């Protein structure tokens, strides 16, 4: 009613399929290798299963100041992460 | 002053239930017509 | 007879692709070990 | 237009969720957050 | 022993819920308002007020 | 209406209601003065959150 | 003839209140359970809820206030055991075993399955569709979860809520410690019926009173704009549902009112069936999801989440509940 | 105790009876509509 | 010269009742807070 | 016509989408706001800040991943991304709670583009606007809990993280610290969230089960017209049935859903009060004559009593995990337990 | 008093029950 | 002096107003193109 | 918070005063319609 | 009828009521203040200021009253513990007993306003109907609301 | 403030409100006025609060 | 029990004031006519 073609006319399209059996699988790629890569660990600094201690700590790498907070974090992952 | 706990809450009963009443009566008496 | 690129195709693909890239990405992340 | 049945693209797109679904609650019990 | 418990409860108790739909919609069709109140023929509007 | 003293003299300062400057008149100039006033609200919101560090500013009982 | 008679009043739709015969038995047992429960929250003795004489104050005369009294539940040493009054060979053993309770919750249990029942009866005396009593099976049915179903699950009456407020929290926060039903995908369903009934109710109050069409003026209520028993609709349903598809898009709107209200009535409905047969299958100790120590790193060192620090505060609610009645490590029930 | 348990039994037998013959009184005809 | 802004002032029965209920449950919520 | 008003006109127009001038403000703020949920539910942890794993890449499912406050040093910092704690790093961003922030604060004004927007359609439409006056309770409930809350207390620390196991350990820590349940607003607000799902529910069923036949189909939904003028459902039948069975009912349609606006709404918004109370700490833990009694009489017990010793168990029992920057080292001999458990 | 007073407000509540159920504006069809 | 946090601030708002300005003149570049027919 | 809800219920109280008795009984459905007018609530859109 | 949530909608076409109703309002606030005062000032301890200062003994608007100077009391002590000090007449008592007097002076100018609510002044003197130059009225409370920050 | 509170009152006294305003804001319109200064009225408020 | 003293009169005067207030507008507006 609003001007535009309605969503059963377009999914049900061949063109539609034609872009779409293309474009769906490659995004649905690129997320499985954006995390099958390493990429998400370093993009948004994840720890790895292997990275949360270093390997005879227990402590948790709590940051305890504000404005060096950034070296904190850059000083618990210097320890062997 | 060791004064009665309840003589506050009578005084104030006995200001307000007649004054109300009173109110009540007045107010209405003022919309009839 | 219907334009193709509108307001509405904007909506649903900024809903729609970050979506699949997300669905692909946890697909992965349901294989990794420890 | 239609020339793909809208009930075969439901039914196509229903067990890709399915699917997706069955692979999270799988990797609910391998991997990652396992406690295995 | 917890399986078999809390399964069929919730089956009991869907089906006590199944039984009073059925119940209730039995009645009104046999007495014939299941699908409503008949607009010329309203009840309530042929009975005295409670007030 | 009753006419007094303080109300002949303050009747011009209550004589051009509904009075208005044609079109946009001064809009512009007075979202120019509200944006001005966002970034001095954000400059002192952000120096009371000690987000802005100024120096000699030392945000603290001293 | 006089049975014909009494049958003519009983299920007479020109009394102010009907009656029906689920009204001849919801009547004496709901006066029973209102006159006991008035009279043991006012003036009740302390109640050994635990079984290990250790007696609680619920009673307004014994200390308690509006908030914190209560009528405690029967004793543990009962357990499920029936205990009237004619079962005790005092009263004052029956105050002090918590035999109130039990009358108390069985007769408006009674009472409240008549309600339903009630409901069905003077719908099919007026005419009119059956299903009200069904809306109103679901919180009748999370009555008989918490003050029935649970207790037989946990094998004592004594785990039944309380009828009281701060005995209502107690229920609760004991609730989480034993069985994590934040956890549990049947209260987070029955949450999402009754956020989304509020929701829903104002939505749908918010529209109507958005569309009404008017009929008055500024001084008076808008209100006044409609008669009791007017044939016309006192609200543009056109003019909501055009609005609310400006707001959301055009096709998550309601334009049939019947499907509408449909959905307002099977929302909350089904989303408090669900909690309440959560409540059910915990009493029969199918818990929530229990996440404790399952993210582990690669060495094996737990790394703790969001469930781990709710095992902690369950950890202690569970160490501290009931704090002398426990001997052996494990509350089995 | 004993004259309370009696008591209490006839007065529960006595409304229940009212139920079960209540609704074995041509209880479906009691509609508006059929009869 | 009368002030012709005047309005007259209607409660009816209903919100007197809804009102009432509304004090009652009210001071029966908070009394205990009251007392303390 | 102008620059504006040609950009109002287009604002306006009829799409699938209504955009408007609210939608300016609106769409990015909360397209923002929900994206950076996902973003963090998805790959970002909670390890330096809480010491929590909180994503699906760490392995967390969709019950216990949460984007989680900032730590309890950085107080209560916008934590923008160029602001001096982060310095323009992404990564460090997310890994000091930055995410947080930025949803927080999206969602804010996306909350605020949202009522603009219900205002904005409201005028378009031509009706009155109590939607978006409606809507202002959860506003309240959003500005109340996520904002003023941690506000008043030490940081964004405390403030609820997005996550539906981290609201889980929020409604326990408000038990365990506050005794929120004995506050009588949040008594307001739970009277009023259950008596909004009993109207709708009851409502919804009064007028299914009250319908004029208008149709010959068993299915009566088909029945109904949208432009029809007569009411669809017997107001005079539901207020007798309902004076019979509960003894009041309702007479006046507008009057019932007023009421329908009123009751979750005002129950929200007393629930807000309630919880800036709570974040000046300012509880109601405690009745004194209850304590003063107790504290002399070893024998009285109450379910508020049991209820305070079940939160000292909470608060001993999970302060030092729940709050790590405290340090807290509890030995098991000072932790409260009763016998045996 | 404090319990006179919760149980004045308690009847009192009763009582409004009853003037609102059997004393109500009687709902008149217009 | 122009402190680090002074030059973050600024940052932040040449970067509000770089977003403001391009999303208000692509809407307006919008409008301009796809009129309204009265 | 109260002064939130005060100036919200003010304004509109003042943007919506021509409807706070109640909106328009001769509202046209082409006005709330989906297609009639190109600008929603713009009679001179006609489309 | 109107309602009673909507009782002071009467005022809305009337300047001179709405004047006398905010005249009422504030000789109601100033004589809140006045009486709170005066309740502290009955109730106050000020012989300890080191262990027991006014924020241990629940004072409220004294310690407005003392950040813009009032530290004195007519009785001969001062909340910062010296002795000797005369206030004058704006001690706390003072500022008290003026705005008790402000009160009854607001109230009195509330009651002229409500009687005498047809002036020549509130309406327009093109049409005769009552009206508010709202605009001119803000720019003349601006000024004098600058007038007073800066002298402050 | 204060100083930019006079010039900005001597404005408001000398320059009339634009007609887009006017319209706009309702300024005709006492209850507007009441809007605008509850909202400036909780934002001090919320400020007094915070210091 | 030790309760506050005030407590009577604070519940006593919140029932009284608003049920006061609201039955001399209902009593006023049933002798309009
Ligand atoms: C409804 C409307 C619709 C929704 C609209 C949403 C818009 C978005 C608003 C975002 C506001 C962020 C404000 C951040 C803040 O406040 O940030 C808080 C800061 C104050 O900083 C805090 O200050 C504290 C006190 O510090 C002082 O005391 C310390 C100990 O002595 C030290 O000496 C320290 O140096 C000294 O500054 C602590 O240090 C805290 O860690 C620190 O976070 O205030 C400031 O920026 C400014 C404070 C002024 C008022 C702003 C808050 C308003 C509400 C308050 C509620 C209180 C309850
Ligand atoms: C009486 C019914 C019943 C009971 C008690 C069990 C019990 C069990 N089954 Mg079983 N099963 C059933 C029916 C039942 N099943 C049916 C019908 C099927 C066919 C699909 C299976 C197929 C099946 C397999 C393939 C496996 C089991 C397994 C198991 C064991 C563990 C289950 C588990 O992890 O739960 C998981 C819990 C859930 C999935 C929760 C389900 C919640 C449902 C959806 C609620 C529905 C509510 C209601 C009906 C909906 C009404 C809506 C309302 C609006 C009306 C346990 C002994 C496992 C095992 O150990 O085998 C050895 C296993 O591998 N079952
Ligand atoms: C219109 C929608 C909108 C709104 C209201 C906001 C609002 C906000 N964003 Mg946001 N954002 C948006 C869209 C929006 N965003 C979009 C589309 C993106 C993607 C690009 C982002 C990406 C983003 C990030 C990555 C971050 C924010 C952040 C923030 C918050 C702080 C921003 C700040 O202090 O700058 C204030 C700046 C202004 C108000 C602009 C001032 C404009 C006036 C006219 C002055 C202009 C002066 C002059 C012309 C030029 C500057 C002079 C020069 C000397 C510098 C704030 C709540 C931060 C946050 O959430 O922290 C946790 C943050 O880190 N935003
Ligand atoms: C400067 C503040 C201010 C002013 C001048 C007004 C003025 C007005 N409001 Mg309003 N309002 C305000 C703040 C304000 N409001 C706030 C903060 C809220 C949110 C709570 C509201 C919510 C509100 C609603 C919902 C409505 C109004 C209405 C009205 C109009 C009629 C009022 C009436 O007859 O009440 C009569 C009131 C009574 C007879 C009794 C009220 C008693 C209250 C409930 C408790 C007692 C309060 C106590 C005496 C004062 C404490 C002081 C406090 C500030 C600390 C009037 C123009 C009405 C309207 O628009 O009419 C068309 C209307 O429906 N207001
Ligand atoms: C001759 C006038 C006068 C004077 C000298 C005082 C003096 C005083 N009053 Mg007072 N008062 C007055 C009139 C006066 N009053 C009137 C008329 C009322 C009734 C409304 C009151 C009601 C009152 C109360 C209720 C209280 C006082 C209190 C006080 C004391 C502390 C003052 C304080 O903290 O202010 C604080 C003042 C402000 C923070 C002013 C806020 C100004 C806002 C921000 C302006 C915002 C709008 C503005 C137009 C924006 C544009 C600005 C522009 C320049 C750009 C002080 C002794 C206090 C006390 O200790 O009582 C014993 C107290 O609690 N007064
Ligand atoms: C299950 C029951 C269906 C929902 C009803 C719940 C509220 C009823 C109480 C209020 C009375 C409300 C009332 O009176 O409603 C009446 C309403 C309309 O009545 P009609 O007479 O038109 O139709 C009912 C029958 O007579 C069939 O014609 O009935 C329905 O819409 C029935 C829905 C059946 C649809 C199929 C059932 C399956 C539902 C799917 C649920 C999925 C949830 C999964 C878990 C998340
Ligand atoms: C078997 C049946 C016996 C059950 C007894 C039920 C009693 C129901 C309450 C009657 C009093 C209601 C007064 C109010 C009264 O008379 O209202 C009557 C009123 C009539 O509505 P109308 O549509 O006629 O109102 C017209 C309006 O325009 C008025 O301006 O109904 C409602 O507003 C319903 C919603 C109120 C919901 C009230 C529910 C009460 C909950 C119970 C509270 C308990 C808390 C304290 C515990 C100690
Ligand atoms: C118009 C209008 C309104 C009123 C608006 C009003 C009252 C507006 C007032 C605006 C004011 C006072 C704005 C002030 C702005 C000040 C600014 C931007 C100052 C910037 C200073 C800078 C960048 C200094 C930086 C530096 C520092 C700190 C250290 C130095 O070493 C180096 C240097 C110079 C770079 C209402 C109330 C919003 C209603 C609607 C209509
Ligand atoms: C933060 C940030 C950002 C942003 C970004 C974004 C905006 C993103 C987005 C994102 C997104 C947007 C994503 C999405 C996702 C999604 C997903 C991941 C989904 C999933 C799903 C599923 C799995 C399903 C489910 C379901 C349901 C829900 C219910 C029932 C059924 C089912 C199962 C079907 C920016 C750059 C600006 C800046 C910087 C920062
Ligand atoms: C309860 C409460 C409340 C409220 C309160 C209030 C609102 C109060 C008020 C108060 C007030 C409002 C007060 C007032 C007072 C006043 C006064 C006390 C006055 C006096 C005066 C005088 C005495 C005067 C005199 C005179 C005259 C008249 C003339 C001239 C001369 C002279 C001066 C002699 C609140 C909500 C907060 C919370 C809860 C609680
Ligand atoms: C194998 C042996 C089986 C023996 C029976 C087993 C138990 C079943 C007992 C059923 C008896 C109930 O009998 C029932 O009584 C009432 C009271 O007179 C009869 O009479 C009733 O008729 C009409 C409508 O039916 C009512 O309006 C009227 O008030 C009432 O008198 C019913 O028509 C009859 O059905
Ligand atoms: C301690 C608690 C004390 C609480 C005090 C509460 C005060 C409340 C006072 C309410 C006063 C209402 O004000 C009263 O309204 C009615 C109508 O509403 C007015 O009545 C006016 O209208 C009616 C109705 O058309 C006419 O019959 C009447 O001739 C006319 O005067 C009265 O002139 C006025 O006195
Ligand atoms: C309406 C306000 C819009 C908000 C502004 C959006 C800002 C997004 C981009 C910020 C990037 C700047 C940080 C990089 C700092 C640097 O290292 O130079
Ligand atoms: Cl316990
Ligand atoms: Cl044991
Ligand atoms: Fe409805």
Same mark, same amino acid.
């Given at each position: 009613?609003?001007?535009?073609?309605?969503?059963?006319?377009?999914?049900?399209?061949?063109?539609?399929?034609?872009?779409?059996?293309?474009?769906?699988?490659?995004?649905?790629?690129?997320?499985?290798?954006?995390?099958?890569?390493?990429?998400?660990?370093?993009?948004?600094?994840?720890?790895?299963?292997?990275?949360?201690?270093?390997?005879?700590?227990?402590?948790?790498?709590?940051?305890?100041?504000?404005?060096?907070?950034?070296?904190?974090?850059?000083?618990?992952?210097?320890?062997?992460? | 002053?060791?004064?009665?706990?309840?003589?506050?809450?009578?005084?104030?009963?006995?200001?307000?239930?007649?004054?109300?009443?009173?109110?009540?009566?007045?107010?209405?008496?003022?919309?009839?017509? | 007879?219907?334009?193709?690129?509108?307001?509405?195709?904007?909506?649903?693909?900024?809903?729609?692709?970050?979506?699949?890239?997300?669905?692909?990405?946890?697909?992965?992340?349901?294989?990794?070990?420890? | 237009?239609?020339?793909?049945?809208?009930?075969?693209?439901?039914?196509?797109?229903?067990?890709?969720?399915?699917?997706?679904?069955?692979?999270?609650?799988?990797?609910?019990?391998?991997?990652?957050?396992?406690?295995? | 022993?917890?399986?078999?418990?809390?399964?069929?409860?919730?089956?009991?108790?869907?089906?006590?819920?199944?039984?009073?739909?059925?119940?209730?919609?039995?009645?009104?069709?046999?007495?014939?308002?299941?699908?409503?109140?008949?607009?010329?023929?309203?009840?309530?509007?042929?009975?005295?007020?409670?007030? | 209406?009753?006419?007094?003293?303080?109300?002949?003299?303050?009747?011009?300062?209550?004589?051009?209601?509904?009075?208005?400057?044609?079109?946009?008149?001064?809009?512009?100039?007075?979202?120019?003065?509200?944006?001005?006033?966002?970034?001095?609200?954000?400059?002192?919101?952000?120096?009371?959150?000690?987000?802005?560090?100024?120096?000699?500013?030392?945000?603290?009982?001293? | 003839?006089?049975?014909?008679?009494?049958?003519?009043?009983?299920?007479?739709?020109?009394?102010?209140?009907?009656?029906?015969?689920?009204?001849?038995?919801?009547?004496?047992?709901?006066?029973?359970?209102?006159?006991?429960?008035?009279?043991?929250?006012?003036?009740?003795?302390?109640?050994?809820?635990?079984?290990?004489?250790?007696?609680?104050?619920?009673?307004?005369?014994?200390?308690?206030?509006?908030?914190?009294?209560?009528?405690?539940?029967?004793?543990?040493?009962?357990?499920?055991?029936?205990?009237?009054?004619?079962?005790?060979?005092?009263?004052?053993?029956?105050? $002090?075993?918590?035999?109130?309770? @039990?009358?108390?919750?069985?007769?408006?249990?009674?009472? /409240?399955?008549? *309600?339903? !029942? #009630?409901?069905?009866?003077?719908?099919?005396?007026?005419?009119?569709?059956?299903?009200?009593?069904?809306?109103?099976?679901?919180?009748?049915?999370?009555?008989?979860?918490?003050?029935?179903?649970?207790?037989?699950?946990?094998?004592?009456?004594?785990?039944?809520?309380?009828?009281?407020?701060?005995?209502?929290?107690?229920?609760?926060?004991?609730?989480?410690?034993?069985?994590?039903?934040?956890?549990?995908?049947?209260?987070?369903?029955?949450?999402?019926?009754?956020?989304?009934?509020?929701?829903?109710?104002?939505?749908?109050?918010?529209?109507?009173?958005?569309?009404?069409?008017?009929?008055?003026?500024?001084?008076?209520?808008?209100? $006044?704009?409609?008669?009791?028993? @007017?044939?016309?609709?006192?609200?543009?349903?056109?003019? /909501?549902?055009? *609005?609310? !598809? #400006?707001?959301?898009?055009?096709?998550?709107?309601?334009?049939?009112?019947?499907?509408?209200?449909?959905?307002?009535?099977?929302?909350?409905?089904?989303?408090?069936?669900?909690?309440?047969?959560?409540?059910?299958?915990?009493?029969?100790?199918?818990?929530?999801?229990?996440?404790?120590?399952?993210?582990?790193?690669?060495?094996?060192?737990?790394?703790?989440?969001?469930?781990?620090?709710?095992?902690?505060?369950?950890?202690?609610?569970?160490?501290?509940?009931?704090?002398?009645?426990?001997?052996?490590?494990?509350?089995?029930? | 105790?004993?004259?309370?348990?009696?008591?209490?039994?006839?007065?529960?037998?006595?409304?229940?009876?009212?139920?079960?013959?209540?609704?074995?009184?041509?209880?479906?005809?009691?509609?508006?509509?059929?009869? | 010269?009368?002030?012709?802004?005047?309005?007259?002032?209607?409660?009816?029965?209903?919100?007197?009742?809804?009102?009432?209920?509304?004090?009652?449950?009210?001071?029966?919520?908070?009394?205990?807070?009251?007392?303390? | 016509?102008?620059?504006?008003?040609?950009?109002?006109?287009?604002?306006?127009?009829?799409?699938?989408?209504?955009?408007?001038?609210?939608?300016?403000?609106?769409?990015?703020?909360?397209?923002?706001?929900?994206?950076?949920?996902?973003?963090?539910?998805?790959?970002?942890?909670?390890?330096?800040?809480?010491?929590?794993?909180?994503?699906?890449?760490?392995?967390?499912?969709?019950?216990?991943?949460?984007?989680?406050?900032?730590?309890?040093?950085?107080?209560?910092?916008?934590?923008?991304?160029?602001?001096?704690?982060?310095?323009?790093?992404?990564?460090?961003?997310?890994?000091?709670?930055?995410?947080?922030?930025?949803?927080?604060?999206?969602?804010?004004?996306?909350?605020?583009?949202?009522?603009?927007?219900?205002?904005?359609?409201?005028?378009?439409?031509?009706?009155?606007?109590?939607?978006?006056?409606?809507?202002?309770?959860?506003?309240?409930?959003?500005?109340?809990?996520?904002?003023?809350?941690?506000?008043?207390?030490?940081?964004?620390?405390?403030?609820?993280?997005?996550?539906?196991?981290?609201?889980?350990?929020?409604?326990?820590?408000?038990?365990?610290?506050?005794?929120?349940?004995?506050?009588?607003?949040?008594?307001?607000?739970?009277?009023?969230?259950?008596?909004?799902?009993?109207?709708?529910?009851?409502?919804?069923?009064?007028?299914?089960?009250?319908?004029?036949?208008?149709?010959?189909?068993?299915?009566?939904?088909?029945?109904?017209?949208?432009?029809?003028?007569?009411?669809?459902?017997?107001?005079?039948?539901?207020?007798?049935?309902?004076?019979?069975?509960?003894?009041?009912?309702?007479?006046?349609?507008?009057?019932?859903?007023?009421?329908?606006?009123?009751?979750?709404?005002?129950?929200?918004?007393?629930?807000?009060?309630?919880?800036?109370?709570?974040?000046?700490?300012?509880?109601?833990?405690?009745?004194?004559?209850?304590?003063?009694?107790?504290?002399?009489?070893?024998?009285?017990?109450?379910?508020?009593?049991?209820?305070?010793?079940?939160?000292?168990?909470?608060?001993?029992?999970?302060?030092?995990?729940?709050?790590?920057?405290?340090?807290?080292?509890?030995?098991?001999?000072?932790?409260?337990?009763?016998?045996?458990? | 008093?404090?319990?006179?007073?919760?149980?004045?407000?308690?009847?009192?509540?009763?009582?409004?029950?009853?003037?609102?159920?059997?004393?109500?504006?009687?709902?008149?069809?217009? | 002096?122009?402190?680090?946090?002074?030059?973050?601030?600024?940052?932040?708002?040449?970067?509000?107003?770089?977003?403001?300005?391009?999303?208000?003149?692509?809407?307006?570049?919008?409008?301009?193109?796809?009129?309204?027919?009265? | 918070?109260?002064?939130?809800?005060?100036?919200?219920?003010?304004?509109?109280?003042?943007?919506?005063?021509?409807?706070?008795?109640?909106?328009?009984?001769?509202?046209?459905?082409?006005?709330?319609?989906?297609?009639?007018?190109?600008?929603?609530?713009?009679?001179?859109?006609?489309? | 009828?109107?309602?009673?949530?909507?009782?002071?909608?009467?005022?809305?076409?009337?300047?001179?009521?709405?004047?006398?109703?905010?005249?009422?309002?504030?000789?109601?606030?100033?004589?809140?203040?006045?009486?709170?005062?005066?309740?502290?000032?009955?109730?106050?301890?000020?012989?300890?200021?080191?262990?027991?200062?006014?924020?241990?003994?629940?004072?409220?608007?004294?310690?407005?009253?003392?950040?813009?100077?009032?530290?004195?009391?007519?009785?001969?002590?001062?909340?910062?513990?010296?002795?000797?000090?005369?206030?004058?007449?704006?001690?706390?008592?003072?500022?008290?007993?003026?705005?008790?007097?402000?009160?009854?002076?607001?109230?009195?100018?509330?009651?002229?306003?409500?009687?005498?609510?047809?002036?020549?002044?509130?309406?327009?003197?093109?049409?005769?109907?009552?009206?508010?130059?709202?605009?001119?009225?803000?720019?003349?409370?601006?000024?004098?609301?600058?007038?007073?920050?800066?002298?402050? | 403030?204060?100083?930019?509170?006079?010039?900005?009152?001597?404005?408001?006294?000398?320059?009339?409100?634009?007609?887009?305003?006017?319209?706009?804001?309702?300024?005709?319109?006492?209850?507007?006025?009441?809007?605008?200064?509850?909202?400036?009225?909780?934002?001090?408020?919320?400020?007094?609060?915070?210091?």
């Amino acid at each position: 009613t609003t001007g535009e073609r309605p969503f059963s006319d377009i999914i049900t399209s061949v063109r539609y399929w034609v872009i779409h059996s293309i474009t769906i699988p490659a995004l649905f790629i690129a997320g499985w290798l954006f995390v099958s890569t390493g990429l998400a660990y370093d993009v948004f600094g994840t720890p790895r299963p292997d990275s949360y201690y270093a390997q005879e700590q227990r402590s948790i790498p709590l940051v305890t100041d504000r404005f060096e907070a950034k070296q904190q974090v850059e000083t618990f992952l210097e320890q062997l992460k | 002053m060791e004064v009665n706990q309840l003589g506050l809450i009578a005084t104030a009963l006995f200001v307000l239930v007649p004054s109300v009443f009173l109110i009540i009566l007045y107010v209405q008496t003022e919309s009839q017509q | 007879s219907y334009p193709i690129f509108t307001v509405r195709w904007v909506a649903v693909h900024t809903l729609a692709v970050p979506t699949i890239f997300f669905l692909g990405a946890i697909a992965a992340m349901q294989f990794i070990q420890r | 237009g239609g020339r793909i049945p809208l009930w075969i693209v439901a039914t196509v797109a229903g067990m890709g969720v399915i699917v997706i679904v069955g692979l999270f609650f799988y990797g609910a019990y391998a991997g990652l957050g396992s406690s295995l | 022993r917890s399986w078999l418990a809390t399964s069929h409860f919730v089956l009991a108790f869907f089906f006590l819920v199944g039984h009073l739909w059925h119940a209730g919609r039995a009645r009104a069709a046999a007495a014939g308002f299941e699908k409503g109140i008949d607009r010329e023929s309203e009840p309530v509007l042929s009975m005295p007020s409670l007030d | 209406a009753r006419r007094t003293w303080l109300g002949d003299i303050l009747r011009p300062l209550n004589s051009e209601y509904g009075k208005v400057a044609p079109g946009w008149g001064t809009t512009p100039l007075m979202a120019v003065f509200m944006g001005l006033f966002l970034v001095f609200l954000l400059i002192i919101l952000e120096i009371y959150n000690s987000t802005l560090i100024l120096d000699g500013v030392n945000v603290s009982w001293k | 003839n006089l049975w014909e008679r009494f049958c003519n009043w009983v299920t007479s739709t020109d009394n102010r209140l009907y009656v029906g015969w689920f009204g001849v038995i919801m009547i004496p047992t709901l006066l029973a359970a209102t006159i006991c429960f008035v009279i043991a929250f006012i003036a009740a003795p302390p109640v050994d809820i635990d079984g290990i004489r250790e007696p609680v104050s619920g009673s307004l005369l014994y200390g308690n206030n509006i908030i914190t009294g209560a009528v405690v539940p029967s004793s543990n040493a009962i357990g499920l055991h029936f205990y009237p009054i004619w079962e005790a060979a005092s009263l004052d053993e029956w105050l $002090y075993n918590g035999g109130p309770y @039990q009358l108390i919750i069985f007769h408006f249990l009674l009472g /409240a399955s008549c *309600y339903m !029942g #009630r409901q069905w009866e003077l719908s099919y005396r007026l005419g009119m569709r059956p299903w009200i009593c069904v809306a109103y099976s679901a919180p009748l049915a999370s009555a008989f979860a918490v003050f029935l179903i649970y207790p037989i699950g946990q094998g004592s009456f004594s785990d039944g809520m309380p009828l009281g407020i701060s005995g209502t929290f107690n229920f609760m926060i004991v609730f989480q410690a034993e069985h994590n039903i934040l956890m549990h995908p049947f209260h987070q369903l029955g949450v999402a019926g009754v956020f989304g009934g509020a929701l829903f109710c104002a939505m749908h109050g918010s529209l109507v009173t958005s569309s009404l069409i008017r009929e008055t003026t500024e001084t008076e209520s808008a209100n $006044y704009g409609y008669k009791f028993g @007017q044939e016309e609709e006192t609200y543009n349903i056109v003019a /909501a549902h055009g *609005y609310f !598809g #400006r707001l959301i898009f055009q096709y998550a709107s309601f334009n049939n009112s019947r499907s509408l209200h449909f959905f307002l009535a099977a929302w909350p409905v089904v989303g408090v069936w669900f909690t309440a047969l959560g409540i059910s299958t915990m009493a029969f100790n199918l818990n929530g999801f229990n996440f404790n120590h399952s993210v582990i790193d690669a060495k094996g060192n737990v790394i703790n989440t969001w469930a781990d620090i709710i095992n902690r505060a369950n950890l202690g609610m569970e160490v501290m509940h009931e704090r002398n009645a426990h001997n052996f490590p494990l509350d089995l029930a | 105790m004993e004259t309370l348990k009696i008591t209490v039994y006839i007065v529960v037998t006595f409304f229940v009876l009212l139920f079960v013959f209540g609704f074995l009184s041509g209880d479906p005809a009691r509609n508006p509509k059929r009869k | 010269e009368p002030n012709p802004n005047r309005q007259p002032v209607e409660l009816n029965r209903t919100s007197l009742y809804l009102g009432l209920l509304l004090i009652l449950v009210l001071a029966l919520l908070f009394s205990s807070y009251f007392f303390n | 016509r102008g620059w504006f008003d040609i950009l109002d006109d287009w604002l306006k127009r009829d799409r699938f989408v209504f955009v408007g001038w609210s939608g300016i403000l609106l769409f990015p703020c909360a397209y923002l706001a929900l994206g950076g949920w996902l973003t963090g539910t998805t790959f970002v942890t909670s390890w330096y800040t809480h010491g929590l794993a909180s994503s699906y890449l760490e392995g967390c499912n969709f019950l216990t991943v949460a984007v989680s406050t900032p730590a309890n040093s950085m107080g209560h910092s916008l934590l923008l991304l160029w602001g001096p704690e982060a310095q323009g790093d992404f990564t460090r961003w997310c890994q000091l709670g930055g995410l947080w922030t930025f949803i927080a604060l999206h969602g804010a004004f996306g909350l605020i583009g949202f009522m603009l927007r219900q205002f904005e359609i409201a005028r378009l439409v031509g009706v009155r606007p109590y939607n978006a006056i409606a809507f202002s309770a959860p506003i309240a409930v959003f500005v109340s809990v996520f904002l003023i809350y941690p506000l008043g207390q030490s940081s964004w620390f405390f403030a609820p993280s997005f996550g539906v196991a981290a609201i889980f350990r929020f409604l326990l820590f408000f038990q365990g610290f506050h005794n929120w349940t004995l506050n009588p607003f949040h008594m307001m607000g739970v009277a009023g969230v259950l008596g909004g799902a009993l109207l709708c529910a009851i409502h919804g069923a009064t007028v299914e089960n009250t319908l004029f036949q208008d149709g010959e189909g068993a299915s009566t939904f088909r029945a109904f017209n949208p432009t029809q003028a007569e009411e669809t459902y017997s107001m005079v039948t539901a207020n007798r049935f309902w004076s019979q069975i509960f003894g009041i009912a309702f007479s006046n349609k507008r009057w019932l859903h007023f009421f329908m606006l009123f009751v979750p709404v005002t129950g929200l918004w007393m629930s807000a009060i309630g919880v800036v109370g709570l974040a000046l700490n300012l509880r109601s833990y405690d009745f004194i004559s209850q304590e003063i009694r107790a504290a002399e009489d070893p024998e009285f017990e109450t379910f508020y009593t049991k209820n305070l010793l079940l939160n000292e168990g909470i608060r001993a029992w999970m302060a030092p995990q729940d709050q790590p920057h405290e340090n807290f080292v509890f030995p098991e001999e000072v932790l409260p337990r009763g016998n045996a458990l | 008093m404090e319990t006179i007073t919760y149980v004045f407000i308690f009847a009192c509540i009763i009582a409004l029950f009853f003037f609102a159920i059997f004393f109500r504006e009687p709902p008149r069809i217009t | 002096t122009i402190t680090p946090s002074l030059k973050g601030f600024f940052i932040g708002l040449l970067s509000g107003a770089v977003v403001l300005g391009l999303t208000f003149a692509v809407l307006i570049a919008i409008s301009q193109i796809d009129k309204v027919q009265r | 918070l109260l002064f939130f809800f005060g100036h919200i219920w003010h304004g509109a109280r003042t943007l919506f005063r021509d409807v706070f008795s109640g909106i328009d009984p001769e509202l046209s459905p082409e006005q709330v319609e989906w297609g009639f007018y190109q600008k929603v609530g713009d009679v001179t859109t006609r489309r | 009828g109107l309602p009673w949530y909507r009782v002071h909608t009467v005022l809305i076409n009337d300047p001179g009521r709405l004047i006398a109703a905010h005249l009422m309002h504030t000789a109601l606030v100033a004589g809140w203040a006045g009486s709170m005062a005066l309740y502290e000032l009955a109730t106050f301890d000020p012989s300890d200021p080191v262990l027991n200062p006014m924020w241990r003994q629940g004072m409220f608007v004294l310690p407005f009253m003392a950040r813009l100077g009032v530290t004195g009391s007519w009785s001969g002590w001062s909340i910062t513990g010296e002795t000797g000090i005369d206030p004058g007449f704006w001690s706390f008592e003072g500022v008290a007993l003026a705005h008790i007097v402000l009160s009854g002076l607001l109230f009195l100018a509330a009651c002229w306003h409500w009687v005498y609510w047809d002036l020549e002044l509130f309406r327009d003197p093109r049409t005769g109907e009552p009206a508010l130059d709202l605009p001119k009225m803000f720019g003349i409370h601006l000024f004098l609301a600058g007038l007073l920050c800066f002298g402050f | 403030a204060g100083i930019v509170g006079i010039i900005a009152g001597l404005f408001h006294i000398l320059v009339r409100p634009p007609q887009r305003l006017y319209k706009a804001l309702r300024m005709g319109n006492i209850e507007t006025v009441l809007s605008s200064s509850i909202a400036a009225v909780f934002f001090a408020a919320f400020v007094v609060a915070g210091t």
